[PDB]
Amino acid sequence: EEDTPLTWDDIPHVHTLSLALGYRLVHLVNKDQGAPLSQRIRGVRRNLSEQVGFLLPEVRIRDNLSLKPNQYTISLNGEVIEQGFIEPERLMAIAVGDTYGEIDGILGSDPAYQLPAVWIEHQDKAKALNMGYQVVDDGTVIATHISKIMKTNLAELFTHDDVEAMTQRLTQQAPKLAEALAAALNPAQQLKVYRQLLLDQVPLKDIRTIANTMLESSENTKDPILLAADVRCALKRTLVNLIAGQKPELNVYALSDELEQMLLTSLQQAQASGTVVLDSFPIEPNILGQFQQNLPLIRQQLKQQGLPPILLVMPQLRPLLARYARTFTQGLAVLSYNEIPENKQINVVGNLG
Amino acid sequence: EEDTPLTWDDIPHVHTLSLALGYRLVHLVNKDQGAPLSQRIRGVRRNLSEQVGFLLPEVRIRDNLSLKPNQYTISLNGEVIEQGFIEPERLMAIAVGDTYGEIDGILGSDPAYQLPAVWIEHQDKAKALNMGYQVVDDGTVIATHISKIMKTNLAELFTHDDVEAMTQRLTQQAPKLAEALAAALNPAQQLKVYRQLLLDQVPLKDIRTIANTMLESSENTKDPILLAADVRCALKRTLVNLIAGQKPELNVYALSDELEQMLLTSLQQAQASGTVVLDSFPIEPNILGQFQQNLPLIRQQLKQQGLPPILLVMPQLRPLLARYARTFTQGLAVLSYNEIPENKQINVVGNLG
């Protein structure tokens, strides 16, 4: 009543990641009933931090009664991105596709990868564990969802303030490099580069061999898409090691010489303007529908054989097609030619007409 | 009599928001009779502050005998904007449209949204509450009116002094961003951008992901309408989340290819001059009457189906049509194409001939 001063502080900040927790599943943060979403959530936030190099933000957790008593929503920067439904006390199990037999569990879905799911009681673990199922506790069904959301939205999770912390962690290793890098690219320019690297989900663990490449290639162009190409050409090793396995033989698609040429025409035309697009899209010659059609099949065709999906392109089209594979197909990999080692021999599968 | 020095201080300042309180309803601020307009008014000024991000001004309250003993006027920056009439002691109830039955209450109107209203005694609440009505105390009839006035005039409520407080509240989060933003856009330039964002009523809660976008896009253009487009493309998520619901399917209008083209002609023509208008209006080819005619129907046609009103345009016409929907229709939403996610599939309703 005597809040007679309202101050800007009364306005609550917004947070990058936040969890909404409905009634039936608030027995997960209460610090007594073996709160998983203070360790399991840190489990993901660590076993993914140390993997992608930069400390992922702190997942905050709130419980808005506004929603159904047994659901949760994950919010990126202000508001929901994905919203799942948790069974009251029936643990979920997944059948990868090699498991056989079913259990009495109520059908559901996998909120992570859109797989069929059965929600089984706490006792039937044996029947799941002895039939070959992939059972998971309640909290993990969330934590895996948060992991997928982080791994997808990696870009927006990298703030204009980590670019300070990255240079700190890099001065710890090569203290003379940053002192020569920060004077070559102002942090506004650096961040765009890390954004372009994290969009296509490239790990920034070995920051030295990344600042080295930015410092090198900074002379020619300060464009943050020509720079993100060079860093990827320098990380070709870990790129392919993460996309495909250590098997030297490699299977991938390739652009159809016709369609591939048809695009380069568009880029050259748009080159009339001052590269109005960086490379994300210069021209939409109505083949965008053809793409939005094939790229799902392109993922699925290679998912008729089990091998991970990859796609080869010209380097000049590399940065473009990354945007499509980032929106249309939830899973893909667009690699250039020079981004693949001369060690791993590749095997084209076919064109795309 | 010995006020022999008259000093500039004797001149009373003017205030952004101020309330006028006639006789019959001064029993609302007197601090004894459960003064609602020191808590309810703060109720709105808080549950709207924390929503739109920036601390709304302090509503001042005065009682000029000049007016009828039972009316009130709300004043923005010097003088009345809206003026309501309060029944002596008969509480008002509203029938949303789904409620059935009437009560003895004297007819009136809803000062908020122009709805039919009945003013009932304090006892008939049950008959209202058991018939399905929306009854409200005297003070709330005001407080809701103040809320509507704030939510409409948000722009003029954002002073050239908050741009200091916004950077303070943003240094609290990303202290290295402002120190790199304030050196990129002088506060005179920043404010115009926040003005353009608040005109179409976009929340500024997540200031980090807004300064980030202004800092980014500041290289190309310092025009505060090309900047307000990029911030909205970056907030597309919360934009649509606030206009429509979380339902992925979406229904909206679209410009008639003919009329849409007819405007772009006008913009290109005006491009002869140095973009004499930012984008609010380059050319009035007498289709302004057609607009002032349709936009009311455009609101109402979609109010024949209950779904919230939206309108799609070209991005190059986006900033223009925002001015019309800000004046002609008290409620509308003009969204571009790139301002809508690729997640929510849209459903056009029809052109506008």
Residue numbers in the entry:
A (entry chain A), B (entry chain B): 343 to 695
Reproduce text from the manuscript describing this model:
Out of the identified proteins we chose FlhA from the lateral flagella of Vibrio parahaemolyticus (Vp-FlhA) and SctV from Yersinia enterocolitica (Ye-SctV) for further studies, as both could be produced in large quantities at high purity using the gentle detergent LMNG. In contrast, Vp-FlhA was found to form the predicted nonameric complex and we imposed C9 symmetry for particle refinement, resulting in a 3.8 Å volume of the cytoplasmic domain but little detail in the transmembrane domain. A striking feature of both structures is the N-terminal density of the cytoplasmic domain, formed by FlhAL/SctVL, which reaches out to bind to the adjacent protomer, demonstrating this well studied interaction for the first time in the context of the full-length protein in both flagellar and injectisome T3SS. In both of our structures a hydrophobic residue, Trp350 in Vp-FlhA and Phe367 in Ye-SctV, sticks into a hydrophobic groove on the neighbouring subunit. This residue in FlhA has previously been shown to be involved in ring formation of the cytoplasmic domain of FlhA. Comparison of our structures with FlhA from S. Typhimurium, St-FlhA, in the open state and Sf-SctV, which is in the closed state shows that both of our complexes are in the open state, with Ye-SctV being the first example of an SctV homologue in the open state. We simulated the movement of FlhAL by overlaying one subunit of Vp-FlhA onto the SD3 or SD2 subdomain of the closed Sf-SctV structure. This demonstrates that adoption of the closed state in one subunit would affect the neighbouring subunit, potentially propagating the conformational change in a wave around the ring. Our structures are not affected by crystallisation artefacts and are in the context of the full-length protein, suggesting that the open state is the default state in the absence of other factors. Our structures also suggest that at least in the open state the residues known as FlhAL/SctVL, which have previously been described as the linker between cytoplasmic and membrane domains, do not form part of this linker but are part of the cytoplasmic domain.
Type III secretion systems (T3SS) are bacterial macromolecular machines that facilitate transport of protein substrates across the bacterial cell envelope. Most building blocks of the virulence associated T3SS or injectisome have a homologue in flagella and one of the most highly conserved parts of the system is a set of transmembrane proteins known collectively as the export apparatus (EA). The FlhA/SctV cytoplasmic domain is known to form a nonameric ring underneath FliPQR-FlhB/SctRSTU, but the full-length FlhA/SctV complex remains poorly characterised. Open and closed states have been described, with the open state being competent for chaperone-substrate complex binding, while the closed state has been proposed to be responsible for binding early substrates.
